[PDB]
Ligand binder design. Structure first.
Ligand SMILES: [Mg+2]
Ligand SMILES: [Mg+2]
Ligand SMILES: [Mg+2]
Ligand SMILES: [Mg+2]
Ligand SMILES: [Mg+2]
Lengths: 125, 94, 282, 50, 121, 410
RNA sequence: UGACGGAGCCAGCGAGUCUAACCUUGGCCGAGAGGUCUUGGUAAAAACUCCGUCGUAACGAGGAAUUCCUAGUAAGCGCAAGUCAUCAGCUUGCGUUGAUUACGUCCCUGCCCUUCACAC
RNA sequence: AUCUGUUUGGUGGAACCUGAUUAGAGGAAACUCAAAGAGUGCUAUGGUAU
RNA sequence: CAUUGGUGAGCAGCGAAGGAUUUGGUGGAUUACUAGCUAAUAGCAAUCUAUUUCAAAGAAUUCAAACUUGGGGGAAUGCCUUGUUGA
């Protein structure tokens, strides 16, 4: 079977499901290229993982992301978290663990929200 | 004992209860185990425990916890009144 | 956490069901004890029950506040959160503050966009004992619901003839001592249940000379609430209103947190039954 | 009743309970001799009568 | 029981013994003191064994199936994997019984609901 | 329970209201507040040492509190739980604040850097994650799952590689310098990691005894039979004495009773580890006992900034020519203890205050370590005290600036 | 920090065979009741992103005093439901976008509490 | 028929309730190996023994 | 349009007298290598046993011996203990 991994990203009610499989660098969001994600002002937000680790790593995989719920911003954050988590999971499962560590180090160095869900749970005081 | 071991000692503590112990003054070395070394030398009773300055034995004398002793003949009338009021407060809080 | 609360509640519900069954056996043991002490013959059903007589030997050495409050009644002081409906008007915010000052251990929390299931879960984590939510209509408070954690009950009230302290000029500041509590004319079993819920909202053991008194007076199921400060004089006692005034009438009481709309209803107000106006339940 | 301990308290309670039961409880059901085999029981009665 | 009914020692110890057994889960209820003689049975202690508690918690279809999973190292109580099928789980410990993180069983549960997240594993 | 060592008395005992078992404990640096956590309560009780009263019960965890620790400097309290979170409590101060930090998995152990600026936590995934307290953001991560050595037990029906019994670290601790972490768990390994570069310095096998259950990864196929493992067959019947034959084991026990209660072989595990405050050594409690690992022998040759001109022969003339400072510095560069000792005792007392001021700052930590190790068992009490007086007076300011570099030596 | 038009696109609550106008002009059938049609009047996701066009009597953001408020908070936007009390002159839920400033101090103003080691 | 929607048969078997069972329920092979139950067949014939 | 659903029909590429999947049996390892048997200060290993027997030594009033039982209530006849009758 084709090697594949699945991951989830969540921000408020926005949920993104990312499938990462062996491939030829085909990144899609809701059946469209990643370049067409909107709003354009926040597009680079979704690009943040792809640029942090370099496009070479993506050149060998296809990523398909399906997003539902929430608004524009929450969907953008869901997409980026899903892409990062899926990439790290794929490098864990079907590539060396050293690359996994390098990816985790880079992402947590830049923004830990890319991996850990940001849940603003209420705190009575 | 059997129930605790059976449950892997995930039991629930027992009710707390208060009990009295008698501590006998001894050199601290005696409390230790037997080998050619000791790790402390002090006594097993603190200095307060040996002697606590309490009420004056003589009725006329008034003795306080700080060690100050005043005989009633010494004390001026304002002092006698002041000490009596302080005794009233100390009794009331107890 | 979530597993334990589910497991504990299931254990409680099982315990109550058994106790209702065990009520008959408890009465039977009482009859046996009376007969032995007085010497009267036992009834036929008891006289022929060999199992009960054997089991009575062990059960001979067997011996209030409501169960939910029994664990912490008078041991831990209550912790209270007072909140409101979404987008509260200004008057409700002032009213919510007054309720916060009424209860010594209350804290006022802003409900902007807080989800109700999230609200209880946050409060349960932080050890909150009771939660109070207020509703309003054109800046006039209309309803008040009190929910006791971790598993209820939830009591909902309707507030009438509300007169806040902000309507008073040069009123001054309140005193926040542990107040004395007066619960008058609560007789029925439901009345005792309502008293227990309202009593435990306050800290235990007010000082004997505390000069603030809170009174809940039931008059035809319309519980009047008043707050006074008193001075003991040489020929009597004089008292002064501190407010606020409002009359609060129970209309529901459920065995569960206010989030759970599925909680079993302990008591509800039936307004359309034929004999509704005849009897007063509290 | 407070001082009595041991078997006497177990036998005392049973005697009291039976006495109250005899008034209303049917004779067959209130008192039932414990089951013992044939050969033994005639042995106990014969010695006891002796 | 033979001690006099009003004795403080009798009431104290009997209550302690009821609470201890109830906490272990051997006794379902703490109300009646007769339960110590009537409702204390080997089956009561057996029902608190790890294989049965999973079956009641529906982690397994049958007791025999649940025993196999323990011997397969799929079951943990707290952070400690358990291979002994005689672990007596108290009432408070019953909350922490769960599958192992990387167990194939746990993957099937999440896969069946389409909730498998490979970052966790 | 609080113990006073000078008089061996239980001078104070604390107890919770709700009758809760305690598994973790942490004490304030000031020795005035004591907090304990439980596996049954989800709350961190806090008491006052002086009065013994329960100050408050810290709440907020949705899982049992697995560990606690106070910051030696900042005095904050860091708590971690199986709730997959870590919470920093500012209990001291007029206002109380709580700052939760999320983690990938359950937290089992926690250690606080002596600086009080970072906290390391071991998770059930086998990860030692270091967080910055003030910023509440991660600053590093160390993998451990591959490093851990875990053995198949005689009773298991699954391999060690697939076994998930213990691939995490249940205890950890920083070196007082702050650059190293020593970790151990329910396993046959004590792993020493270096924090700044996130690498495993060394791994230590706890035991090599086959009597213990967890020692071996691979078991002998000869022991397996149709009946089963020959080890699992109980041979108590053969024993001649009755007290040997009698079996007192309860069916389901795992811990908290005598070995006879178990019926199963002891399992190799390290309950806790710690570094030595005074010496370069660490102690690890295990089933067999407290294994103490030390560097005292120091047979190693570890020259520092050595050159061709430096030689054990060359050092001796520097003494013969009365160039004590050059002799002493060259002695450290070789880093030979016997040579450092030779120069250390040959320097006259008149020249000690001169030499002490002129030692390069780099070698100051080494000499202080040597004097500490040498003075404890050496017979030259006054000579060392002259040295210690000389060094502290000359380089007292430098030591104060770098506290944690000199902590163990001081 | 506009108006007009077009284009792109994102929520979560909610499921009782239950869900919803008024007044007229006239044709035909019908014993009646009524049936059917005809006819005029009255009433009754948004934010956001991009593109194009124009263009900057009373009242123009509201005095003095006074009230409230610390994080998914203040504020803005819409969509549902009407749950035996209250509510439609409206009430309660739901999601979306989402900050500034403090998180110290007892100086002022109120309220409150006090007068088993080692070390002090 | 971007008609209508009842009925028959097949597929599927949520909730409640009832009954039985419970080291979950089955299936296939035989010149296999056991432990039992029922019926049937056979002059199955020393009333006192060549 | 998408299948990270199954079953097939064929390329690109890889590619030295073929390639892939499963499986029975034995051997060596899985603890650190001082040789076999016996009546053992030596014989045997083809065994003797047609010297293998004698001598010497060797017997606690411990003449005690269930540390070994699921709980409650009894135990006719047994068994244990104590006393007693008559030889
Ligand atoms: Mg608002
Ligand atoms: Mg609005
Ligand atoms: Mg409103
Ligand atoms: Mg503050
Ligand atoms: Mg093979």
């Amino acid at each position: 079977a084709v090697p594949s991994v699945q991951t989830f990203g969540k921000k408020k009610s926005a949920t993104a499901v990312a499938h990462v499989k062996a491939g030829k660098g085909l990144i899609k969001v809701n059946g469209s290229p990643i370049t067409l994600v909107e709003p354009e002002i926040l597009r680079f937000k979704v690009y943040e993982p792809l640029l942090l680790v370099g496009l070479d790593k993506f050149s060998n995989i296809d990523i398909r992301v399906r997003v539902t719920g929430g608004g524009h911003v929450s969907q953008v954050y869901a997409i980026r978290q899903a892409i990062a988590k899926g990439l790290v999971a794929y490098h864990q499962k079907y590539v060396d663990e050293q690359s996994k560590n390098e990816l985790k180090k880079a992402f947590t160095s830049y923004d830990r929200t890319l991996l850990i869900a940001d849940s603003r749970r209420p705190e009575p005081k | 004992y059997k129930l605790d071991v059976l449950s892997s000692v995930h039991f629930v503590p027992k009710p707390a209860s208060t009990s009295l112990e008698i501590r006998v003054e001894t050199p601290t070395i005696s409390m230790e185990d037997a080998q050619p070394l000791y790790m402390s030398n002090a006594s097993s009773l603190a200095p307060q425990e040996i002697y606590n300055v309490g009420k004056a034995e003589k009725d006329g004398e008034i003795r306080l916890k700080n060690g100050v002793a005043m005989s009633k003949e010494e004390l001026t009338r304002e002092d006698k009144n002041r000490l009596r009021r302080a005794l009233k407060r100390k009794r009331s809080k107890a | 956490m979530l597993r334990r609360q589910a497991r504990e509640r299931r254990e409680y519900l099982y315990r109550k069901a058994q106790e209702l069954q065990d009520s008959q056996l408890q009465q039977k043991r009482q009859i046996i004890k009376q007969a032995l002490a007085q010497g009267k013959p036992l009834p036929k059903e008891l006289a022929e029950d060999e199992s009960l007589q054997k089991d009575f030997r062990y059960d001979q050495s067997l011996k209030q506040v409501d169960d939910e409050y029994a664990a912490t009644s008078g041991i831990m002081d209550p912790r209270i959160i007072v909140t409101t409906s979404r987008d509260p008007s200004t008057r409700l915010s002032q009213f919510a503050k007054e309720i916060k000052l009424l209860f010594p251990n209350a804290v006022r929390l802003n409900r902007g966009n807080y989800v109700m299931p999230n609200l209880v879960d946050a409060c349960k984590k932080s050890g909150t004992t009771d939660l109070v939510v207020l509703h309003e209509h054109r800046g006039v408070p209309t309803s008040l619901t009190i929910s006791h954690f971790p598993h209820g009950p939830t009591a909902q009230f309707s507030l009438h003839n509300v007169v806040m302290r902000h309507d008073i000029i040069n009123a001054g500041n309140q005193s926040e001592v542990n107040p004395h509590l007066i619960f008058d004319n609560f007789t029925t079993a439901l009345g005792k249940r309502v008293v227990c819920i309202l009593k435990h909202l306050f800290n235990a053991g007010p000082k004997k000379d505390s000069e603030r008194v809170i009174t809940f007076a039931n008059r035809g199921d319309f519980i009047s609430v008043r707050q006074h400060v008193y001075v003991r004089t040489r020929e009597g006692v004089e008292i002064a209103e501190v407010g606020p005034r409002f009359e609060m009438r129970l209309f529901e009481l459920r065995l569960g947190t206010l989030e759970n709309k599925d909680a079993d209803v302990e008591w509800q107000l039936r307004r359309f039954i034929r004999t509704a106006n005849k009897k007063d339940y509290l | 009743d407070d001082q009595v301990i041991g078997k006497a308290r177990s036998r005392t309670l049973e005697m009291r309970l039976n006495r109250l039961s005899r008034v209303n409880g049917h004779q067959d059901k209130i008192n039932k001799l414990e089951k013992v085999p044939m050969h033994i029981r005639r042995g106990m009665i014969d010695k006891h009568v002796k | 029981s033979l001690l006099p009914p009003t004795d403080p020692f009798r009431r104290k110890h009997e209550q302690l013994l009821l609470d201890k057994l109830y906490a272990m889960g051997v006794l379902t209820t703490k109300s009646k003191i007769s339960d110590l003689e009537n409702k204390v049975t080997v089956s009561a202690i057996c029902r608190r064994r790890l294989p049965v508690i999973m079956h009641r918690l529906k982690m397994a279809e049958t007791i025999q199936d649940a025993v196999k999973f323990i011997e397969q190292g799929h079951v943990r109580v707290g952070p400690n994997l358990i291979n002994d099928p005689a672990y007596l789980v108290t009432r408070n410990m019953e909350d922490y019984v769960t599958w192992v993180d990387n167990s194939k069983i746990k993957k099937t549960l999440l896969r069946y609901r389409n909730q498998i997240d490979d970052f966790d594993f | 329970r609080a113990w006073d060592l000078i008089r061996y008395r239980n001078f104070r005992t604390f107890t919770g209201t709700e009758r809760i078992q305690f598994n973790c404990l942490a004490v304030d640096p000031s020795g005035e507040v004591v907090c304990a956590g439980s596996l049954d309560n989800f709350d961190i009780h806090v008491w006052s040492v002086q009065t013994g009263q329960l100050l408050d019960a810290l709440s907020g965890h949705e899982g049992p509190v697995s560990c606690l620790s106070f910051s030696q400097e900042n005095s904050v309290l860091a708590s971690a739980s199986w709730d997959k979170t870590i919470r920093i409590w500012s209990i001291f101060g007029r206002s109380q604040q709580v700052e939760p930090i999320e983690v990938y998995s359950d937290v089992l152990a926690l250690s606080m850097r002596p600086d009080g600026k970072e906290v390391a936590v071991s998770t059930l995934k086998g990860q030692i994650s270091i967080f910055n307290i003030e910023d509440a953001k991660q600053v590093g991560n160390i993998d451990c799952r591959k490093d851990i050595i875990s053995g198949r037990f005689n009773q298991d029906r699954f391999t060690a590689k697939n076994s998930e019994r213990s691939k995490f670290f249940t205890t950890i601790h920083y070196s007082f310098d702050g650059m190293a972490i020593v970790a151990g768990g329910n396993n046959n390994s004590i792993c020493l990691y270096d924090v700044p570069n996130e690498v495993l310095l060394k791994r230590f096998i706890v035991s090599r005894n086959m009597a213990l259950n967890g020692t071996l990864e691979f078991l002998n196929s000869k022991k397996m039979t149709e009946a089963g493992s020959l080890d699992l067959i109980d041979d108590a019947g053969e024993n001649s004495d009755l007290e040997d034959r009698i079996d007192n084991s309860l069916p389901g026990s795992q811990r908290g009773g005598d070995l006879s209660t178990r019926k199963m072989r002891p399992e190799v595990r390290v309950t806790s580890v710690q570094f030595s405050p005074t010496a370069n050594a660490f102690a690890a409690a295990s089933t067999e006992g407290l294994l103490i690992y030390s560097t005292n022998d120091t047979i190693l040759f570890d020259p520092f900034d050595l050159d061709v001109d430096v030689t054990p022969h060359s050092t001796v003339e520097a003494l013969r020519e009365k160039q004590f400072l050059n002799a002493l510095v060259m002695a450290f560069r070789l880093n030979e203890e016997y040579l450092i000792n030779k120069v250390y005792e040959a320097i006259p007392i008149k020249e000690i205050p001169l030499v002490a001021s002129n030692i390069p700052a780099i070698y100051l930590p080494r000499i202080l370590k040597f004097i500490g190790d040498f003075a404890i068992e050496s017979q030259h009490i006054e000579f060392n005290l002259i040295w210690i007086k000389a060094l502290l007076s000359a380089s007292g300011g430098y030591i104060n600036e770098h506290k944690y570099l000199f902590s163990t030596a001081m």
